[PDB]
């Protein structure tokens, strides 16, 4: 039974967990753990990006639509 579980890849799940793992240390104050209480004492007391996003979307929409043009129906229409 174990082989069936093994068949599925784990690097994908490893990266998904790595997201939480990285976030946990990123949101924290970057202080060595032994001396973090000293800092905790202190603790106690876009438009351009979206516009660029739209432009990239238009390029993406063109790329997806080009698949239909690959057919020879255009050649048949030219023949007609």
């Amino acid at each position: 039974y174990t082989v069936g579980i093994v068949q599925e890849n784990n690097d994908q799940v490893w990266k998904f967990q790595r997201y939480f793992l990285v976030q946990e240390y990123c949101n924290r104050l970057n202080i060595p753990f032994p001396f973090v209480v000293f800092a905790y004492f202190y603790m106690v007391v876009d438009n351009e990006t979206l516009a660029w996003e739209g432009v990239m979307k238009e390029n993406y929409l063109v790329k997806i639509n080009t698949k239909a043009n690959d057919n020879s129906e255009e050649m048949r229409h030219r023949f007609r």
Partner: protein, 276 residues
Amino acid sequence: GDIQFGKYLRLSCDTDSETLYELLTQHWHLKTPNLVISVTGGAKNFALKPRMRKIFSRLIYIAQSKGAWILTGGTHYGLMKYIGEVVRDNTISENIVAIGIAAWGMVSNRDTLSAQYIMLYILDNNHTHLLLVDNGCHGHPTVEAKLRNQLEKYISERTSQDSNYGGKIPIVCFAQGGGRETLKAINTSVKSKIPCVVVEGSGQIADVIASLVTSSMVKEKLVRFLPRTVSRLPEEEIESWIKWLKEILESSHLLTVIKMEEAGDEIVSNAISYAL
């Protein structure tokens, strides 16, 4: 007044083209490897078909790659607003230069100045630079065609050694829609020898101009293309249109037509290169 909501000026019709070129070159812009002028009717509504939506996107991309100038009317109503919006988004994404030319009197509102223009004709604010022609007040007929034609001719006469094009700076006129102004501009351009490109398969008059490439055939094509435009026009206007069309078709070795069958990519550049 410097519009803000780039730059905007008010130049009278009797203006020296050399003075304008010096103004634009000394402290505003650089030498132009290429220059393309688009002509469209004054209709506020235009057909935003996918063909026209992609051809002009390719045109503007080519202009940015070559650092070319683009000359349009400069009004918020019509295809020129689309061109301005595309310019804006490309700039948001080595800067493009776009110039709009219109008569000051034809503008709905006039403010003297750095004044601010906030939304009779309405002008697009997307275009970096604009020109105002002072020929009259509330003048419906076009008063900027002469200035634009003279400027284009003078720029054609200019010499630039850095350009790969032999000697003078290249210029290419682009035709998309119908109307008397379109034919007048095309006839003046062809008479000036600057090559013109017409998009076949789209546009009211572009289709007939592509079809042609004496009076009976042109009349039939014109009535077929524009059932309503011909009806309103008097007989004298129709005869004048036929004369203009015959004039431009006489010099058919210059103009080039984009074909519907060649619907693949890299067609705008191919047509422009072939015409040049």
